[PDB]
Design a binder for this molecule. Structure first.
Ligand code: P5S
Ligand code: P5S
Ligand code: P5S
Ligand code: P5S
Ligand code: POV
Ligand code: POV
Ligand code: POV
Ligand code: BJX
Ligand code: 65I
Ligand code: 65I
Ligand code: 65I
Ligand code: 65I
Ligand code: 65I
Ligand code: ATP
Lengths: 592, 148, 361, 333
């Protein structure tokens, strides 16, 4: 750190993540989480005794500091390819595992039992310490640096060695892959040096258009090899994309599914925290003993208000980091899908014939919109693909546990959200229909004034400006009526977007008191439901757009597949300059 | 955009006011937290404008390149220059993608940072609200509003 | 969501003739990269350093390179950690022995007077720093504690000897002495003895002599060979024009260092016209020698860009005799005065002399 | 079989000294040998020196108390020679305290026995001497700069190509650290089993090689990687290196020795590499490495050793002088 203040080699240095870099961080974050649980239990138990009992949590409090440094120390040994310092790290995992296990087995001798939380967490720590120990040993197996005579050194990847690569997201520590920490330097640089193509450097190998195009062709080539299908239809393309980009699309879904589940921890923590505060009796406390240390149990651990707030804080960090990582994985795949499809479309442009039956039908405008409109709506579909797999899950899980929170009246009120959603699909559809009317009319007026602004000298020396301007105004009035309809539908869209959740709560709570009257609507139950409605409104009132994009994407692939199997320039695969003997030329593929 | 911009900043004002009222100890830490929020809201706009300008100005040559290839397809195949034009496309497409990838990262950089700040608010608000519900006797009513 | 892009269509409208970017285009006159700054501090940043840990393998070189406030932190941490690492050892040994229990001393304590970890920490200070108050003795009835007393002393002796060695190499640092070796802000080119030369003044401020001084001069410029090479920063050595050829100089008064521009010089075709700011030219001057006090060699690096050259100017006299001794008036260190000189290049000067010699004969 | 290397790619001269008529010169330089030892090995000598020293005087203190009758069980009438010596373990602990200067003081040196006063004097003199010896050795170990040479970097293989007409054996040397090597120096030597017209046979003849410096010297300024080339003139021993005999089993080797005092410590260091016959690529140049940034330069150490193909004659430098002379003579007429 003192040298880093005056270190210039780290200005553009390269790295090499050791074998097990991902399994190290995922264990460390799990280990950090459980060490917080031990702290919470330790401070929970000692509150009943007259003494501090510092041995309950300070050993765990020192572990949390040691665990954090163990990954800071490991990272500094990862950036500088000097694995020899991992011996100190290796000793720590060997030593911590042995000492903790002795504690764990001694709990069983005194018959602590799993019914005590400290026995569970200590047992868990043995597994986490053991697994982290195996990670360090696996480094020696692949790097071979301590004992083996010939170390199998590893060099930084070739794409990283380029000075012209500045999007270092694919190769950074797992914490920076989640928090996007590497962007900090680029963002700060944007304040002083404006961002041009100089700052945005060459993209990495994984995201290069040529690299993606190779994978798409391999997906097509393997499809035509494993399966012998003559046509290349919409299903042929759909199966092609999944092969070439499924292994990343599933990762985006996995993050979204977990972030969706972790999102409901908020309402459960809100329900848990307030319910404990809805009880007048705070003199009561966890009370069970084995030696006099007063081990706390599971249910008593999740009854303390402060415990749930801390667990909520940990859960929120995971949810809001998985959710953001879900977006990036979905987006990066979408950008690569666009990159590998623009190349495929352009590669089809070279290999297509120039027949008047072919090129006289699909003008340049037809193929230009294919790249702009047809590809983007397909590209945007891969952005929202995780939603349609998970938004049903998030809504169902939302509905399942919203039934338990308040009862039936919540489902009756939430039905209004579900029942009015199909109308919102109609509003959005009617919004677009009015949008195309303006879009087609704006182009007509803009094309009309383009002639006006092109011959202005003849339109100004002949005093025709007053006459020609009136044509623009009249065309504008026919344009502005369409825009007024669009403005109406987008105004109604906002109303249904924001007034339905208020209507859902209004129906839910009044209906609960009047029709049901099954409870007093305590803040534990009422305010837990308010969070659930906020969490459910966002997927409920945006799932219409996911469906609409999927409908549009089906057209785009259908349109793309029709274009991709058009006439081609034959005889490509198969003395005087102009040597023609027979020369029975033609334009129709067969005959004529 | 104006309707959603006002609703976004008013909901933040509405939320912050209620959290401050439920737990007056929160606004003691809000000022140190708001300053960090300002700098995140400061550097982002400088980069976001530049990236979005780079986002648009990089895709205009791409669509024109497609249009001109369709216009003069016969000439390009005649010169046997399709090898170079495909290489131009990869240079045109890669510039378009890398401009968009940085734009996405900037949005993701903002969204992660502006949600750890929100997470730090939740812990601070929950901690003070629970304590003020044990000593000042908030009676768990405003505590729920302080959380939702 | 509260975003304008909640539901958007596939949009593409022809923004016809999107021209006139009106870019600032200020990169042309942004800066001219320097090879070495005016005060050493080479302005070169390395990239793609494939380090294999050799950055930290030179621990004892690294510790000296660190600034003094950092050294104090490492000095403090290296000893605080050692005291506290063995504080846990003494506390735990007395815990396992059983003399930590606050009761009648029926047994013989492993290390006397250890009552709390505070006493365990203070006893760790006494052993390693060798204060040895003696309230907390080491008893003979603890065979394990005797081993740790041996270990703590050896580690305490080993840490001290290593830390003393690092400090001595930092006390002998002479990079601060090299900052009192002064070069003029701008060097001049003027005629001396009928031949053009690149003059320069370098002075020493402290009264302590710098022994075995040795001055080198190099030209940093991009060089293309007849074979078409591309050498970005080519360094060509420049003779000092000393009377004996060597680089050795005797620095008491501020000496004039000049390079006689003969036919073998890289500056043989420099004209005042091409001496503007953005000219691919730089002269690096490296003054070496061993400081007479610490015996440690030093370097003083300075560079002259093209806009830091002054064609056809003379260095003012600086040494003036006084009643009992000489006198160097450093106020006039870098003052320059114009001189009558040709505005032509060295090649033209040689060519004009060559034509005149033929006409005379 | 195999071809030996005079010096490996990282120094480490592969020469085996044999039949050494050892007069004990290995041990006479204990202080120099102690520094040459590895750090783990130094600790053993460091530890065993102190541990034996404490234990040598532990026996002395125990014997003194035994003879004086102090360790006789029971509270005797005599004044103890050294207080609280009731075991050799107590004598061992008192031995540690005196020499390390902890001085707890539960075991004092009384005024009764004069023999212990002498031994107390002896132990302090021995303690100060041994500590002074160990401090000096560790200071020179902490002042070691051989590991600095590990950051001095040479290209894997050198090249011979064209530059300003003549033929030069080019090369590249880089410095990875940020500290400077004051007063750098480059010596290049060609090692070949060279015979002489008189009939002598030199098994490994080392002929020095000029560095083609601007001032005909050895001083170089190492901040960014440089090209250390040697112009192959009429006197260069490489004047008759044809590309044909550049193969593996060619008795050829270029030693390069970079010397200079490290600015941090002031210790001179050497970096040595050898380019074998198979480690020289004819007719290749070194890629441009130093780029320019907004206000600084940029060295791409990824491209430190990359060489590209460059057109060149495939004839010996001796045939270059003859070809030029014939062309110049023909052009004159
Ligand atoms: C063949 C023999 C192998 C011996 C293996 C020993 C295993 C010990 C296990 C205990 C954990 C320690 C990890 C050490 C890993 C092995 C030693 C090691 O390689 O050190 C790494 C570095 C420099 O070494 P190197 O020049 O690359 O040596 C090559 C290699 N050791 C070999 O010869 O094959 O060394 C360093 O970087 C050392 C840092 C010293 C810092 C000095 C600061 C001054 C204060 C000192 C006191 C501080 C208090 C804490 C004490 C410990 C400090 C590290
Ligand atoms: C008891 C449990 C309670 C809760 C605590 C749980 C804490 C555990 C955290 C678990 C995180 C799991 C993430 C797993 C994903 C790891 C990254 C990953 O696999 O992708 C890495 C990739 C780059 O590789 P590639 O070149 O595509 O791989 C080659 C080829 N495709 C192949 O794999 O064959 O690159 C990518 O695809 C980028 C992926 C980015 C992923 C970013 C995730 C960061 C999460 C950070 C969490 C924030 C802090 C939370 C900790 C709280 C503790 C207090
Ligand atoms: C991006 C930002 C990066 C910032 C990096 C810098 C961080 C600085 C931290 C600021 C607080 C430091 C307090 C230090 C107080 C003593 C030092 C002092 O007053 O300066 C006097 C100097 C240090 O000055 P320098 O210009 O930095 O020297 C660099 C040196 N010329 C070199 O470059 O080479 O030093 C000397 O000239 C050395 C004389 C030492 C003698 C004094 C004895 C003190 C011993 C320690 C006492 C404190 C013990 C505390 C123990 C606490 C235990 C709980
Ligand atoms: C009763 C118990 C008493 C215990 C006393 C211990 C005292 C510890 C003091 C704590 C601070 C010490 C810091 C010193 C570490 C500095 C190491 C460092 O920077 O260089 C690392 C070096 C590597 O170079 P080398 O090959 O040895 O160089 C030789 C050269 N001629 C020279 O002397 O510079 O050195 C190396 O090679 C690796 C250095 C690792 C340090 C060793 C620590 C102890 C290891 C013990 C096990 C060793 C087993 C193997 C023995 C050798 C087998 C070949
Ligand atoms: C559990 C996996 C979650 C992450 C899965 C995706 C990564 C798979 C790739 C891989 O080979 O993993 C790792 C091997 O690591 C191992 O093979 C660990 C084996 C540990 C054994 C422990 C036994 C218990 C490779 O490491 P990485 O972190 O993928 O390195 C990324 C390379 N880059 C950043 C330089 C571009
Ligand atoms: C800068 C540093 C000085 C630090 C002084 C102590 C700091 C903790 C304070 C504390 O409660 O210590 C405690 C130990 O505490 C431990 O055992 C902590 C062990 C942690 C390792 C050292 C810190 C890292 C002290 O309590 P104790 O040792 O149990 O006291 C003996 C009890 N008796 C008096 C009843 C016999
Ligand atoms: C490393 C040691 C520190 C830890 C020591 C723990 C074991 C105690 C050793 C011990 O008492 O030795 C005993 C024998 O043993 C010797 O005299 C040993 C002689 C060889 C020692 C060096 C070996 C290398 C010494 O016996 P004593 O105490 O002299 O017995 C008479 C004194 N009393 C009867 C009054 C008690
Ligand atoms: C530029 C578009 O790149 C992105 C892409 C995504 C993935 C995604 O599902 N998007 C659509 C969702 C569908 C229903 C339109 C969206 C757009 C605007 C605002 C919010 C949302 N939803 C996001 C998921 C949770 C509910 C609200 C996220 C974020 C971004 C981003 O701006 O960085
Ligand atoms: C509850 C969840 C908490 C998660 C926290 C754990 C992750 C942190 C990772 C830090 C990291 O990885 O940062 C390190 C910071 O290092 C220092 O500043 C030196 C150490 C100073 C302090 C001892 C090293 O990276 P660097 O210095 O930027 O790397 C350049 C060198 N190659
Ligand atoms: C370091 C890694 C993360 C730490 C997570 C802390 C979780 C604690 C959960 C329990 C809780 O928050 O407990 C309270 C703790 O408060 C403190 O004193 C602050 C402790 C600060 C710890 C650094 C005590 O109140 P109580 O449980 O009602 O006990 C009262 C009767 N004594
Ligand atoms: C709110 C949640 C709690 C945790 C807060 C801290 C999070 C740190 C993220 C770690 C990270 O992001 O780690 C590195 C960043 O280092 C630093 O500079 C850390 C500075 C830390 C400052 C406190 C990334 O370095 P890299 O991308 O591997 O760079 C390679 C070459 N260095
Ligand atoms: C764990 C992640 C979540 C953190 C939540 C809050 C985010 C900011 C705090 C983290 C941080 O410290 O990030 C800062 C953000 O950076 C800037 O853009 C400059 C801002 C300067 C004025 C504020 C500084 O980082 P940096 O010094 O540019 O990082 C490189 C050297 N490591
Ligand atoms: C499909 C059925 C519904 C599933 C709902 C989603 C479940 C989310 C996880 C469970 C949860 O959120 O667990 C709550 C505490 O939060 C955590 O433990 C978060 C993890 C923190 C990790 C960092 C426990 O609360 P509870 O026992 O339900 O309290 C009221 C009951 N009296
Ligand atoms: N970026 C770099 N950082 C540090 N050392 C480097 C770097 N590039 C090359 N070297 C060093 O240069 C020498 C070899 O350079 P060169 O590039 O010609 O060969 P190489 O094939 O990369 O070497 P090797 O496989 O031995 O690392 C080695 O001593 C190597 O450590």
């Amino acid at each position: 750190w003192g040298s880093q203040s005056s270190k210039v080699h780290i200005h553009h240095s390269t790295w090499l993540h050791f074998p097990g870099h991902n399994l190290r961080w995922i264990l460390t974050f799990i280990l950090l989480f459980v060490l917080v649980c031990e702290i919470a239990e330790g401070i929970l138990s000692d509150g009943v005794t007259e003494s501090r009992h510092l041995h309950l949590y300070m050993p765990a409090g020192m572990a949390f500091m040691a665990a954090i440094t163990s990954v800071v120390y490991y990272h500094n040994i990862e950036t500088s390819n000097f694995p020899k310092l991992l011996i100190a790290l290796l000793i720590y995992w060997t030593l911590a595992f042995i000492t903790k296990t002795i504690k764990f087995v001694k709990f069983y001798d005194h018959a602590i039992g799993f019914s005590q939380l400290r026995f569970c967490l200590t047992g868990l720590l043995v597994i986490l310490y053991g697994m982290l120990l195996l990670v360090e040993v696996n480094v020696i197996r692949v790097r071979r640096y301590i004992f083996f005579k010939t170390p199998r050194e590893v060099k930084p990847p070739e794409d990283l060695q380029d000075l012209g690569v500045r999007f270092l997201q694919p190769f950074v520590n797992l914490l920076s892959k989640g928090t996007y920490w590497w962007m900090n330097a680029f963002i700060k640089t944007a304040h002083k040096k404006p961002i041009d193509l100089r700052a945005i450097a060459k993209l990495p190998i994984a995201m290069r258009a040529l690299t993606n195009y190779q994978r798409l062709c391999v997906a097509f080539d393997a499809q035509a090899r494993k399966d012998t299908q003559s046509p290349q239809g919409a299903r042929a393309i759909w199966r092609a994309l999944c092969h070439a980009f499924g292994r990343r699309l599933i990762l985006s879904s996995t993050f979204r599914i977990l972030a969706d589940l972790l999102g409901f921890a908020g309402p459960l923590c809100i329900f848990g925290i307030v319910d404990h505060l809805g009880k007048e009796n705070h003199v009561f406390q966890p009370k069970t003993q084995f030696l006099g240390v007063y081990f706390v149990s599971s249910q008593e651990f999740l009854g303390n208000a402060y415990v749930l707030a801390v667990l909520l804080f940990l859960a929120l960090l995971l949810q809001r980091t998985f959710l953001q990582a879900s977006y990036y994985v979905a987006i990066e795949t979408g950008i690569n899908l666009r990159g590998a499809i623009q190349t495929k479309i352009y590669n089809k442009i070279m290999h297509m014939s120039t027949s008047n039956l072919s090129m006289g039908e699909m003008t340049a405008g037809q193929i230009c919109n294919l790249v702009a409109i047809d590809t983007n709506q397909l590209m945007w579909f891969f952005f929202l693909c995780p939603n349609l797999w998970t938004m049903p899950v998030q809504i169902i899980v939302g509905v399942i546990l919203l039934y338990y929170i308040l009862g039936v009246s919540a489902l009756i009120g939430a039905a209004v959200i579900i029942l009015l959603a199909p109308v919102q699909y109609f509003v959005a559809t009617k919004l677009s229909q009015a949008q195309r009317t303006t879009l087609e009319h704006s182009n007509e007026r803009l094309k009309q004034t383009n002639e006006m602004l092109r011959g202005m000298k003849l339109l100004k020396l002949y005093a025709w400006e007053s006459i020609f301007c009136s044509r623009v105004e009249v065309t504008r009035r026919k344009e502005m009526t369409s825009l007024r309809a669009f403005a109406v539908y987008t105004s109604i869209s906002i109303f249904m977007n924001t007034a339905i959740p208020i209507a859902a709560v209004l129906i839910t709570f009044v209906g609960h008191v009047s029709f049901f009257k099954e409870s007093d609507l305590s803040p534990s139950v009422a305010f837990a439901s308010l969070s659930l409605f906020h969490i459910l409104v966002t997927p409920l009132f945006l799932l219409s757009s996911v469906v609409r994009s999927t409908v549009k994407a089906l057209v785009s692939v259908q349109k793309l597949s029709e274009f991709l199997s058009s006439a081609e320039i034959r005889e490509e695969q198969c003395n005087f300059c102009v040597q023609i003997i027979g020369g029975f030329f033609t334009w129709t593929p067969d005959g004529i | 955009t104006l309707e959603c911009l006002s609703r976004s900043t008013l909901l933040c004002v509405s939320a912050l006011t209620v959290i401050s009222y439920v737990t007056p100890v929160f606004l003691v830490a809000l000022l140190p937290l708001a300053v960090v929020c300002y700098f995140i809201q400061k550097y982002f706009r400088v980069a976001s404008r530049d990236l979005q300008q780079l986002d648009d100005t990089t895709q205009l040559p791409l669509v024109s390149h497609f249009a001109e290839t369709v216009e003069g397809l016969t000439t390009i195949r005649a010169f046997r220059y399709e090898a170079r034009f495909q290489q131009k496309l990869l240079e045109y497409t890669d510039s378009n993608n890398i401009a968009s990838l940085f734009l996405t990262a900037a949005n993701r950089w903002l969204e992660v940072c502006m949600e750890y700040i929100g997470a730090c608010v939740v812990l601070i608000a929950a901690a003070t609200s629970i304590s003020n519900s044990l000593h000042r006797e908030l009676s768990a009513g405003l505590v729920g509003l302080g959380l939702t | 969501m509260l975003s304008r892009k909640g539901i958007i269509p596939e949009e593409y409208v022809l923004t016809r003739l999107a021209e006139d970017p009106t870019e600032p285009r200020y990169r042309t006159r942004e800066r001219r990269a320097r090879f070495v700054s005016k005060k050493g501090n080479c302005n070169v940043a390395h990239k793609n350093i494939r380090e294999q840990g050799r950055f930290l393998q030179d621990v004892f070189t690294t510790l000296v390179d660190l600034k003094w406030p950092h050294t104090l932190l490492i000095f403090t941490m290296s000893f605080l950690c050692s005291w506290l690492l063995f504080a846990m050892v003494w506390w735990l040994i007395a815990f396992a022995h059983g003399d930590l229990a606050p009761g009648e001393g029926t047994n013989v304590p492993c290390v006397t007077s250890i009552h709390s970890f505070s006493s365990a920490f203070l006893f760790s200070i006494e052993v390693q720093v060798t204060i040895g108050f003696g309230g907390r003795m080491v008893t003979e009835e603890c065979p394990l504690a005797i081993l740790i007393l041996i270990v703590q002393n050896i580690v305490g002796l080993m840490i001290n000897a290593i830390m003393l060695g690092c400090i001595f190499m930092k006390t002998a640092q002479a990079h601060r002495r090299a900052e009192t070796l002064i070069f003029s802000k701008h060097a001049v080119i003027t005629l001396r003895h009928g031949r053009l030369c690149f003059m320069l003044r370098v002075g020493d401020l402290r009264k302590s002599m710098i022994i075995s001084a040795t001055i080198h001069m190099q030209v940093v410029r991009k060089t293309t060979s007849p074979e078409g090479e591309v050498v970005p920063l080519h360094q060509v050595d420049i003779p000092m024009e000393n009377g004996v050829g060597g680089n050795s100089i005797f620095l008491v008064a501020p000496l004039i260092i000049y390079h006689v521009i003969d036919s073998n010089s890289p500056l043989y075709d420099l004209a005042p016209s091409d001496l503007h700011h953005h000219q691919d030219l730089e002269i690096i001057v490296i003054l070496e020698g061993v400081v007479e006090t610490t015996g440690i060699t030093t370097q003083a690096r300075t560079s002259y860009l093209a806009d830091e050259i002054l064609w056809g100017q003379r260095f003012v006299p600086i040494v003036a005799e006084e009643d009992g001794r000489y006198s160097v008036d450093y106020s006039k260190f870098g003052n320059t005065v114009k001189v009558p000189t040709p505005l032509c290049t060295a090649r033209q000067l040689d060519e004009d002399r060559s034509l005149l010699d033929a006409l005379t004969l």
